[PDB]
Amino acid sequence: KPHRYRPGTVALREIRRYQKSTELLIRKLPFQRLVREIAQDFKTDLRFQSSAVMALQEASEAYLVALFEDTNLCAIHAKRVTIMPKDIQLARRIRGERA
Amino acid sequence: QRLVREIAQDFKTDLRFQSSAVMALQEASEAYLVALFEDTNLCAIHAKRVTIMPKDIQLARRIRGERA
Amino acid sequence: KRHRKVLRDNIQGITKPAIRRLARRGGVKRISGLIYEETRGVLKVFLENVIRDAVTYTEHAKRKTVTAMDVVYALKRQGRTLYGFGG
Amino acid sequence: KVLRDNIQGITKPAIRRLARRGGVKRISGLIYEETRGVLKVFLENVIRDAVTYTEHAKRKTVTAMDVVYALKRQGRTLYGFGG
Amino acid sequence: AKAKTRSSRAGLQFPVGRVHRLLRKGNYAERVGAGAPVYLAAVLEYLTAEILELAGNAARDNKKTRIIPRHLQLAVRNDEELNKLLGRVTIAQGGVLPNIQSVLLPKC
Amino acid sequence: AKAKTRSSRAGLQFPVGRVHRLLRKGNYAERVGAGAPVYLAAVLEYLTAEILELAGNAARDNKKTRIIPRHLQLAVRNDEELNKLLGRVTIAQGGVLPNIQSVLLPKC
Amino acid sequence: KTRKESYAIYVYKVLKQVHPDTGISSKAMSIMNSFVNDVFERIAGEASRLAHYNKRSTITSREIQTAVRLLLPGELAKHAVSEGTKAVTKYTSAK
Amino acid sequence: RKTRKESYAIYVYKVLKQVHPDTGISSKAMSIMNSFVNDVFERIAGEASRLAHYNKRSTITSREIQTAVRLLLPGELAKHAVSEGTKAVTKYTSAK
């Protein structure tokens, strides 16, 4: 009885929404708390200039999007629509970032 | 030696090549193509097919970034 | 405090909706149930090869802070030059 | 009977050999047309750089150096012919 | 006396002097001719003229009179000649081009 | 005055003499540290000795005394760790590592 | 103190010759601070190596021109050099 | 009969004769070395010249080639590589 959108149509709304805007996507505070954790063993007691914690965010996210875009052809090239883990292993392989 | 002396002819006129340099291209063209087919197969096998198709060279050339 | 740091579970910081927005920006209509645990591998691996180059600059200049004027200079090595923080 | 656009001088069996070396098992019939495109793109660039040095260096002879360098710019260094 | 700018001398908006200063201090070569730095300003004058001019059109074509990076990425990704020059960079805060693949559209 | 090469003094074979010149004249900086070329000599030593000792091994696999451009390409690619230093370089007459996807081979 | 040098003024002017009304916010001005410094290094790079390659010693007008055609693609190479040749002759006109 | 061309033909030749006293090296498979050494050399010095340009220091000293070598080389080879210099400089300094 209650109205429901069909599956998939809500996504297309976002694809036209998030591709329009230009703010960040990953939650800020955890993403910094990751960079300290991962950087913890390269050196002791590192202090990131807070200008350069976002500078990763605007430089790693413009890399994931450069990935999800690029698998999306491959999942399309395999007659499918959904991306699957088997897709990325290809996608990083042509570039040369895993092999 | 009769292919490149033609493409180069359009960029400038009366180009006398050096016999070693023609070999230098001749290694790269093979080196450029061989790698492309190797990655081409990866797209073909990813299609569950086993034969490559011209729609896979064009896919495998946009992933690398040469397409733009 | 003067000791200890955030060194556990942060890799779970990228929650399921958090990546979902990213995939939406890329233009993926339908997302699989298993992609999430895979990029979290990919995302961390890339971050290693940027900080590890980033830190190596700071250690050389005897600093104890990574400055954006260095994360830019680490990134420039890997092709992904990053306008808008320095030059 | 050779007077034609020499791009067909890269004959179809030659194309087949490469794909074998590339590990290609079954080659479609249409690949023989698009490949002559790709190779026509690639040499369009590398010779474009190659002549520029020579035109610069007052040399009417494109030399082995002035193609090792041009390959270096594309991020495909070519060991062996100089340096 | 009555010194005048070399930038004005050649009618170049960009600084002729500073560029000639980075052609020594950068150790790009031991000696720099009197002709090169003038040329490198003008190209930079031309090259930053077309990235800006095209951006200015798009922002006005989004009713905003001040250029913001989202207005600045559209002038390089959509301009085919420049896109081959900024092919590697990732402009901060840049957004991405609106693009949905045809297969992605609904059935109708 | 009796002369001995710096190459002897640092226990090195690559020419700390010659490598020193290519820094001074290679326009990499105004002044090059006296201890700079020597350190550059050894780091080449470990980066020339590493390939060949892998390359000579592939010579035995072919039972050939002479070491061949085929072997270097063979030696430089199997070693996963040395691969990432030369990911985008192609060696003349190198051939390709023999590999075939498991699917192309028949199931029985 | 802390005098840091940049191209914040020159870019803003060359905007005005092409658009006298459009203002440029600082973020989209930090980029053009980065963008020029990028292209300047990139062009000077192959500017040097030709001087090295031919065993010459000095960058001059010429070893810049044969650097532009390599780096900037497409007809930009044909537009820019025109904005270069007229630049030196005007310069040597008032030399 | 003049204009001495310069190469690393002789130097790659020696260091062959110490990890393989028997092996003989082809001519072309030594042109590669005469290019691969000039390759890594330039990718190092030309990368040191960035560090002595960013840090405003107007010289290249052992530290600079001791991080550049730690940067370019992938992972494990960094550990052995800097070892070859450090002992080299010390031995050089122990008889400088």
From Swiss-Prot, chain B:
N6-glutaryllysine modification, residue list: K12, K48, K55
Subunit structure: The nucleosome is a histone octamer containing two molecules each of H2A, H2B, H3 and H4 assembled in one H3-H4 heterotetramer and two H2A-H2B heterodimers. The octamer wraps approximately 147 bp of DNA.
Phylogenetic classification of the source organism: Eukaryota, Metazoa, Chordata, Craniata, Vertebrata
Record's subcellular location: Nucleus; Chromosome
Residues recorded as bearing N6,N6-dimethyllysine in the entry: K12
Family: Belongs to the histone H3 family.
Location of Phosphothreonine modifications: T13, T40
Portion held of the full protein: 69 to 136 of 136
Residues covalently joined to lipid (S-palmitoyl cysteine): C43
Signal sequence annotation: none
Positions of post-translational N6,N6,N6-trimethyllysine modification: K12
Post-translational modification, as annotated: Acetylation is generally linked to gene activation. Acetylation at Lys-55 (H3K122ac) by EP300/p300 plays a central role in chromatin structure: localizes at the surface of the histone octamer and stimulates transcription, possibly by promoting nucleosome instability.
Keyword set includes Nucleus: yes
GO MF annotation terms: DNA binding; protein heterodimerization activity; structural constituent of chromatin
GO CC annotations, alphabetized: nucleoplasm; nucleosome
Protein name per the record: Histone H3.2
N6-methyllysine: modified positions: K12, K55
N6-acetyllysine carried by residues: K12, K48, K55
Key words, A-Z: Acetylation, ADP-ribosylation, Chromosome, Citrullination, DNA-binding, Hydroxylation, Lipoprotein, Methylation, Nucleosome core, Nucleus, Palmitate, Phosphoprotein, Ubl conjugation
Record function comment: Core component of nucleosome. Nucleosomes wrap and compact DNA into chromatin, limiting DNA accessibility to the cellular machineries which require DNA as a template. Histones thereby play a central role in transcription regulation, DNA repair, DNA replication and chromosomal stability. DNA accessibility is regulated via a complex set of post-translational modifications of histones, also called histone code, and nucleosome remodeling.
Modified residues (Phosphoserine): S19
Organism, scientific name: Xenopus laevis
Swiss-Prot record, chain C:
Coiled coil region boundaries: none
Positions bearing Phosphotyrosine: Y36, Y73
Keyword DNA-binding in record: yes
Modified residues (N6,N6,N6-trimethyllysine): K5
Annotated GO biological process: nucleosome assembly
Phosphoserine modification, residue list: S32
Cross-link entry Glycyl lysine isopeptide (Lys-Gly) (interchain with G-Cter in UFM1), positions: K16
Coarse class of the protein's main subcellular location: nucleus
Positions of post-translational N6-propionyllysine modification: K1, K16, K29, K62, K64, K76
Covalent crosslink: Glycyl lysine isopeptide (Lys-Gly) (interchain with G-Cter in ubiquitin): K76
Keyword Amino-acid biosynthesis: no
Record PTM N6-butyryllysine, positions in chain: K1, K16, K29, K62, K64, K76
Modified residues (N6-lactoyllysine): K1, K16, K62, K76
Positions where N6-succinyllysine occurs in the chain: K16, K62, K76
Subcellular location: Nucleus; Chromosome
Residue numbers of N6,N6-dimethyllysine PTMs: K5
Maturation and modification: Demethylation is performed by JMJD6. Monomethylated, dimethylated or trimethylated at Lys-5 (H4K20me1, H4K20me2, H4K20me3). Monomethylation is performed by KMT5A/SET8. Trimethylation is performed by KMT5B and KMT5C and induces gene silencing.
GO CC list: nucleosome; nucleus
GO molecular function, one term: structural constituent of chromatin
N6-methyllysine: modified positions: K5
Positions of modified residues (N6-(2-hydroxyisobutyryl)lysine): K1, K16, K29, K44, K62, K64, K76
Its job: Core component of nucleosome. Nucleosomes wrap and compact DNA into chromatin, limiting DNA accessibility to the cellular machineries which require DNA as a template. Histones thereby play a central role in transcription regulation, DNA repair, DNA replication and chromosomal stability. DNA accessibility is regulated via a complex set of post-translational modifications of histones, also called histone code, and nucleosome remodeling.
Family note: Belongs to the histone H4 family.
Assembly with partners or alone: The nucleosome is a histone octamer containing two molecules each of H2A, H2B, H3 and H4 assembled in one H3-H4 heterotetramer and two H2A-H2B heterodimers. The octamer wraps approximately 147 bp of DNA.
Protein name from the UniProt record: Histone H4
Organism name: Xenopus laevis
Lineage: Eukaryota, Metazoa, Chordata, Craniata, Vertebrata
Residues of the full protein shown: 17 to 103 of 103
From Swiss-Prot, chain H:
Cellular component annotations (GO), alphabetically ordered: nucleosome; nucleus
Localization annotation: Nucleus; Chromosome
Cross-link Glycyl lysine isopeptide (Lys-Gly) (interchain with G-Cter in ubiquitin): residue positions: K91
GO MF entries: DNA binding; protein heterodimerization activity; structural constituent of chromatin
Post-translational modification: Monoubiquitination of Lys-91 by BRE1 gives a specific tag for epigenetic transcriptional activation and is also prerequisite for histone H3 'Lys-4' and 'Lys-79' methylation.
This protein's UniProt keywords: Acetylation, Chromosome, DNA-binding, Glycoprotein, Isopeptide bond, Nucleosome core, Nucleus, Phosphoprotein, Ubl conjugation
Glycosylated sites: S83
Function: Core component of nucleosome. Nucleosomes wrap and compact DNA into chromatin, limiting DNA accessibility to the cellular machineries which require DNA as a template. Histones thereby play a central role in transcription regulation, DNA repair, DNA replication and chromosomal stability. DNA accessibility is regulated via a complex set of post-translational modifications of histones, also called histone code, and nucleosome remodeling.
Oligomeric form and interacting partners: The nucleosome is a histone octamer containing two molecules each of H2A, H2B, H3 and H4 assembled in one H3-H4 heterotetramer and two H2A-H2B heterodimers. The octamer wraps approximately 147 bp of DNA.
UniProt family annotation: Belongs to the histone H2B family.
Official protein name in the record: Histone H2B 1.1
Organism: Xenopus laevis (African clawed frog)
